[PDB]
Symmetry: D2
Subunit: 114 residues, 4 copies
Amino acid sequence: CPLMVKVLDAVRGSPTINVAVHVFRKAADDTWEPFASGKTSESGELHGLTTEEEFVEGIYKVEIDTKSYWKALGISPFHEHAEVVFTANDSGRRYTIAALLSPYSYSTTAVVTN
Amino acid sequence: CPLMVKVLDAVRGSPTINVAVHVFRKAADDTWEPFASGKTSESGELHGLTTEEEFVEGIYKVEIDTKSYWKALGISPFHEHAEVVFTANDSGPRRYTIAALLSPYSYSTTAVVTNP
Amino acid sequence: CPLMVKVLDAVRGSPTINVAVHVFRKAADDTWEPFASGKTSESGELHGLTTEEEFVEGIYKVEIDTKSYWKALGISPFHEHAEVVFTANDSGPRRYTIAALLSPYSYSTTAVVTNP
Amino acid sequence: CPLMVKVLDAVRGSPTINVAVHVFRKAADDTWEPFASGKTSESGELHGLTTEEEFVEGIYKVEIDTKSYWKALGISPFHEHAEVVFTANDSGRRYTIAALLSPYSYSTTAVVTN
């Protein structure tokens, strides 16, 4: 898969499990078309969101439901979610979106290889 | 002003100057209404976006135009922008500082919330 | 003061108060000499650690006692502290702001460097 | 291995390759005894630093030579290195030390499992 999502918990020092992630692609009318989604695994990872054929150039949004996660832990969060918006190519790779979560802070990083 | 935005450049170790910032509020429509906008100063800060009267309860989105910043420096960044979405003033008026730290392929955002 | 330390709590979204900060400078010995120390204020900031006269070229270490902070809150953190080591004033006098953002199992540190 | 190190480059969006990492254990006289070391792989990871038998409770320091990395890229860095100091146990796990590097900023996170 050319697109993977890895989420970590900076309060507990652990992968975030069962966190909902939605992926959108920007449409012609500049609205967000649902594209893919899932829930992070026990390793805090989400694989097999798309394929090389489906993942064409364009602008994508990755939305991590961080609020629901912190609610499950009984911790009051600041953000409604974590949103990463990026342009796939040019030109032509494997994308790993990493997210490090705290209740009042998050960081996201793109690891782009091949 | 109950809402302040501060941006830093993690590559140069300096405040980001002239960075565009757009604020939106979720209408009952469920659509995003333009709420306020501006650009960061020399200190990388943006003050006076709004007032205590105007800044009511709601869900707000703060879009920082990081792409324009990096490209002006000859850098092609990963992100289109840095976007912060949060519920404000749910338990009464607060003062919010939104801090962003920018790298070409990474950013972090932190909220500092105080009771005026 | 050419050296300022600022600390934030990423769990509460607030400045960290009464956080111990110890500064060291590498002697020709290659050992760390106690240079200065203090505690953060209500704003999570620590000013007046040193002066332009005293703050010469060298390698400096800034140890933030994050463990004590978290444990006071009933939290058992991963890190013993947050430690920043850097060469200062190599190309002339600069003003340094060391920013730390604290979570129980994670921290980030950023340097903001300006020419006075 | 009960201790792994993963390093990423936030400027290029890539794992950091060939970055020297040194591990120390605090001794009785409170000095840092060299314990293990190596260079990150093509995946920016460093495995097999120690074993379950060797990795006993105590205070450890992990030192990442970030300065040399940025020098190789021709980018002026702020820090001399990135240092993570922590106490292994109590009580009794797999430690992953993650580091996200920028020239004037770094973040480190502990992922502790099992």
